[PDB]
């Protein structure tokens, strides 16, 4: 019997219960009965879409902007004092419908905001994201992964994403995967245990082992002592004292000679450990650090023990016929030992005319992969010393000819080789002449062309496009790269190489590529072949 | 010592960090573990998880001294209704006994079953 | 009675990045119970501290057990009973900085008080419930005492 409404009829619920049982002084009741002092603006907001029909954009962005304003209001007027109370009270028709329709970022930002209260709302929204078909895809939060049913499935879909990705996606997805599984070290334990059980199989478990090794490398970067977890997952703990020695040594992150005598007494006997205890890559990286730094002298007595340990790591084969070995061999680790000994002598002698002299023996050595990885780390630690480029022969291409040898005789080192070349190319060399810096960059681009020749092309051209577009280098260097690449290649052309090599050539310095070639035609041939491949160019 | 549950919650209960903190082998002495064994159901799940992960960072001889008390803490940890404590107890039950962690995590858990089934299919098709 | 802070620490490191000064070294110490770090400059000559030691450390606003709040003048003839007779290494200095893990929205949890004893620096990083007695630009004492 009030009859005092403008648009408070939409609030007809709580009004009605305050209408029949009003009593006492209903001043506040009547004031809230007519607190909707505007017109029918809940319908006129729907008429704003009809006005947008005359506007520039009658699309779904208007309802998206209204829902974004509603989400910003629900986060601004978030009921943080009674968040867990309102979570634990109703929760049946509201959170279920909201996760049915508007589960895009609302409850995700709500669980990103506080995440300690509202365990009923967090549990219902987590179970509804579990009811979502693709996953865990809404809960992409480094601190909302503290629930096991959530985190296991998020781990599953991220592993599926990486394992369908490949080596290209190995660089892009792995920090976005590793910030979750290194957030808590117990989550690291869960993830590495899953890596172990999946890498029990020889039918594609090598990529799982690889992803485990990059997660372990990221754990070593961020600050874990994750080597003890790594050895506790391994079979190496079945032979206790060797694994304990590795545990202390990889907890120190450095080589102790007494510790390697403890290892070496257990090796080269008639009962070796299973070779997967020594194949851990952080251990071989500490070997490269302690052995092939240009300083860091090794005291000539347990040196052959070091070389024999690296040779046994990178040499021997085995046949695990139902968890036992019956046929191993040691007949190439003498050549491996001789090669790594010759290379450590050449890195110990530190005399550069001798480095030019024994370069044929060094070319004989880099036929071996562990030798080539070690020479790559040594040339990294030598050439990247500041104020190095002051010996100048053809702007010092000697170590870069060793880069060409490493790139020639192997293929798996090519990411590290490209990483070294793009580390030197980004590095501005002070105290050099600017023409001299420019010819140093021309030499590094000659090395990148040599990497492009041996198959490893797409990250190189991707970097050249990245440094023409983003944060630009000198245009003459890219012109020289295009000039040297197009003086060696010939059709047929794979579509990815055309798709990646087209925009750097056609945009931004057409004219500089052709000056005086004549006998073999310039970029015009590549443009003609690019028109003949694609569907016009598109 | 006295009030040792409060002592573990004081030295380990900074919930803003989630790794095993350093000097955890200097915080886990056999007398301290034998003080934990009677007040183990009182302290919080985060501190309990720090404790169970820190029991792996001990050296091998200290684990080999008093592995029975560590197994008792494991058996009390497997009874807790927390998901993390149950899973970490299921992993860590084989570490003081053998030296290696558990690899058979497959029973009593539909989570491990779903992840292993989907990932065995995925690994089988991604060679 | 005038004590701002009291805890037993345990020496973990003595000046681990090398010894910058021969007569004074810094001690990286952890607490026995409260989970707090203390970095302390001490004179090794008149008061040698070895690694693995355990000591009590009591910041007091004054030495006089009644809390009479002296100005800070050197009175070697005052026979009022002070608390320094319980201890064996008393350093007087001013607390110059209280930084902490704080946010512009919520309060600080982990505080870090800085105090210079003449020139001998001490950082005490603990929780805010234990470092609440500290105030910036006030005068404190140190009162450490080693014990087996």
PDB file of C-alpha atoms in Angstrom, chain C residues 49-102:
ATOM      1  CA  UNK C  49      83.729 -14.618  19.136  1.00  0.00           C
ATOM      2  CA  UNK C  50      84.235 -17.941  17.385  1.00  0.00           C
ATOM      3  CA  UNK C  51      81.939 -19.673  14.941  1.00  0.00           C
ATOM      4  CA  UNK C  52      79.288 -21.939  16.398  1.00  0.00           C
ATOM      5  CA  UNK C  53      78.992 -19.818  19.537  1.00  0.00           C
ATOM      6  CA  UNK C  54      75.669 -19.139  21.205  1.00  0.00           C
ATOM      7  CA  UNK C  55      74.939 -15.871  22.959  1.00  0.00           C
ATOM      8  CA  UNK C  56      72.179 -13.880  24.596  1.00  0.00           C
ATOM      9  CA  UNK C  57      71.544 -10.413  23.174  1.00  0.00           C
ATOM     10  CA  UNK C  58      69.392  -7.849  24.985  1.00  0.00           C
ATOM     11  CA  UNK C  59      68.739  -4.438  23.472  1.00  0.00           C
ATOM     12  CA  UNK C  60      67.877  -2.171  26.393  1.00  0.00           C
ATOM     13  CA  UNK C  61      66.910   1.487  26.289  1.00  0.00           C
ATOM     14  CA  UNK C  62      68.985   2.044  29.420  1.00  0.00           C
ATOM     15  CA  UNK C  63      71.331   0.065  31.614  1.00  0.00           C
ATOM     16  CA  UNK C  64      69.840   1.277  34.885  1.00  0.00           C
ATOM     17  CA  UNK C  65      67.319  -1.355  35.950  1.00  0.00           C
ATOM     18  CA  UNK C  66      64.812   1.231  37.207  1.00  0.00           C
ATOM     19  CA  UNK C  67      64.534   2.836  33.766  1.00  0.00           C
ATOM     20  CA  UNK C  68      65.833   6.227  34.861  1.00  0.00           C
ATOM     21  CA  UNK C  69      66.486   7.237  31.202  1.00  0.00           C
ATOM     22  CA  UNK C  70      69.936   8.813  31.214  1.00  0.00           C
ATOM     23  CA  UNK C  71      70.923  11.332  28.557  1.00  0.00           C
ATOM     24  CA  UNK C  72      73.965   9.452  27.309  1.00  0.00           C
ATOM     25  CA  UNK C  73      76.881  11.164  29.041  1.00  0.00           C
ATOM     26  CA  UNK C  74      79.871   9.174  30.213  1.00  0.00           C
ATOM     27  CA  UNK C  75      79.446   8.787  33.981  1.00  0.00           C
ATOM     28  CA  UNK C  76      82.116   6.322  35.163  1.00  0.00           C
ATOM     29  CA  UNK C  77      81.496   7.205  38.822  1.00  0.00           C
ATOM     30  CA  UNK C  78      77.764   6.471  38.997  1.00  0.00           C
ATOM     31  CA  UNK C  79      77.338   3.543  41.390  1.00  0.00           C
ATOM     32  CA  UNK C  80      73.661   3.085  40.600  1.00  0.00           C
ATOM     33  CA  UNK C  81      73.253  -0.652  39.842  1.00  0.00           C
ATOM     34  CA  UNK C  82      73.059  -1.114  36.075  1.00  0.00           C
ATOM     35  CA  UNK C  83      72.259  -4.254  34.125  1.00  0.00           C
ATOM     36  CA  UNK C  84      75.703  -4.326  32.464  1.00  0.00           C
ATOM     37  CA  UNK C  85      77.078  -6.371  35.367  1.00  0.00           C
ATOM     38  CA  UNK C  86      75.009  -9.304  34.125  1.00  0.00           C
ATOM     39  CA  UNK C  87      76.636  -9.070  30.697  1.00  0.00           C
ATOM     40  CA  UNK C  88      80.129  -8.966  29.263  1.00  0.00           C
ATOM     41  CA  UNK C  89      79.921  -6.889  26.068  1.00  0.00           C
ATOM     42  CA  UNK C  90      77.912  -3.659  26.147  1.00  0.00           C
ATOM     43  CA  UNK C  91      77.666  -1.499  23.035  1.00  0.00           C
ATOM     44  CA  UNK C  92      75.817   1.826  23.024  1.00  0.00           C
ATOM     45  CA  UNK C  93      74.554   3.227  19.751  1.00  0.00           C
ATOM     46  CA  UNK C  94      71.667   4.788  17.920  1.00  0.00           C
ATOM     47  CA  UNK C  95      69.106   3.024  15.762  1.00  0.00           C
ATOM     48  CA  UNK C  96      69.096   4.790  12.418  1.00  0.00           C
ATOM     49  CA  UNK C  97      66.774   2.902  10.071  1.00  0.00           C
ATOM     50  CA  UNK C  98      63.727   0.654  10.373  1.00  0.00           C
ATOM     51  CA  UNK C  99      62.913  -0.661   6.911  1.00  0.00           C
ATOM     52  CA  UNK C 100      60.500  -3.500   6.378  1.00  0.00           C
ATOM     53  CA  UNK C 101      58.490  -5.634   4.007  1.00  0.00           C
ATOM     54  CA  UNK C 102      55.522  -3.281   3.733  1.00  0.00           C
TER      55      UNK C 102
END
